[PDB]
Amino acid sequence: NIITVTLNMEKFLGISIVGQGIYIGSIMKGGAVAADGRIEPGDMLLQVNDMNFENMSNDDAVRVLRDIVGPIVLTVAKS
């Protein structure tokens, strides 16, 4: 259930992120994540391209994700 969606085509993920401890709050039309369809809202975002958000300040992780936009590989723990 800890899926590792890696779908992407370089040029937007199309998601929103909430922090409690970081998970997917919404999926928006037209983005890479929406195209894949598997990372449902509420799934926890565990890893992005082998970078783990564990302990890492939610902001630092968010900035990292900002920085990544090469291909984006998301590891999510589906509810």
Numbering used by the authors: 264 to 274, 277 to 285, 293 to 341, 345 to 354
Direct quotes from the study:
The central event in Wnt-PCP pathway is the activation of Weak-similarity guanine nucleotide exchange factor (WGEF) by the adapter protein Dishevelled (Dvl). The PDZ domain of Dishevelled2 (Dvl2PDZ) binds and activates WGEF by releasing it from its autoinhibitory state. Dvl2PDZ binds to both C-terminal as well as the non-canonical internal peptides. Using biochemical and molecular dynamics studies, we show that a unique “internal-PDZ binding motif” (IPM) of WGEF mediates the WGEF-Dvl2PDZ interaction to activate the GEF.
The only hit, 349-GSTFSLWQDIP-359 (hereafter referred to as WGEFpep), obtained from the sequence search, lies between the DH and the inhibitory domain of hWGEF. Therefore, to obtain the structural basis of Dvl2PDZ–WGEF interaction, initially, we tried to crystallize this protein complex. Despite extensive efforts, crystallization trials met with no success. Hence, we resorted to crystallizing the WGEFpep (peptide) in complex with Dvl2PDZ. Furthermore, we tried to obtain the WGEFpep–Dvl2PDZ complex structure by fusing the peptide with the C-terminus of the PDZ domain. Due to the lack of structural information on the WGEFpep–Dvl2PDZ complex, their binding mode has remained unclear. In addition to the WGEFpep variant peptides the minimal hWGEF (330–581) construct, obtained from our solubility screening, was used for the MST study. It is interesting to note that the affinities of WGEFpep and N3pep are nearly identical for Dvl2PDZ, with dissociation constants (Kd) of 45 ± 5 and 54 ± 7 µM, respectively. Furthermore, the substitution of tryptophan (WGEFpepW7A), aspartate (WGEFpepD9A) and proline (WGEFpepP11A) residues at the P−2, P0 and P2 positions, respectively, with alanine completely abolishes the WGEF–Dvl2PDZ interactions. Compared to the other known Dvl2PDZ–internal peptide interactions, in the WGEF-Dvl2PDZ complex, only five residues at the P2, P0, P−1, P−2 and P−3 positions appear to contribute significantly in stabilizing their interactions.
